[PDB]
Subunit: 60 residues, 3 copies
């Protein structure tokens, strides 16, 4: 019982500490939209590069 | 005591597991930094697309 | 013994709540990939801005 009382006090402290620093699902709720925007940027930059390359040849 | 011993044992395993699997507030800070970079990029790319369109018209 | 079982009961409830609300390392596993792509995008957009400025001047 002396052991079990100390262990519970340890767990209490451990739970409050990890609760303080744990990321929640709410915190990362935006992740899919962030990924989408990176994907959008990859495409738009690719197409911009192609257009700029064509323009660089036309201007000469 | 027989219950406590069993319950505390499982609780310790669960808490250890949570600590290992969890993402943290530091990861959230990093996500927010990335969001800020992406937002800047979206703005820059929009402006670039507008300039390129103007140049395409004027070169033609 | 009874008060310990009470505190353990509350703790089990707290842990179950945390387990359901937890975001995990596997969940954000794509974060480093996005970070790498974004660093490359920053570089590419820098170069695009430079080339567009040069073309604007020329035109």
């Amino acid at each position: 019982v002396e052991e079990l009382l100390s262990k519970v006090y340890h767990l209490e402290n451990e739970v409050a500490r990890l609760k303080k620093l744990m990321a929640t699902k709410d915190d990362i709720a935006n992740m899919k939209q962030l990924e989408d925007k990176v994907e959008e940027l990859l495409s738009k930059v690719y197409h911009l590069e192609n257009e700029v390359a064509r323009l660089k040849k036309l201007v000469g």
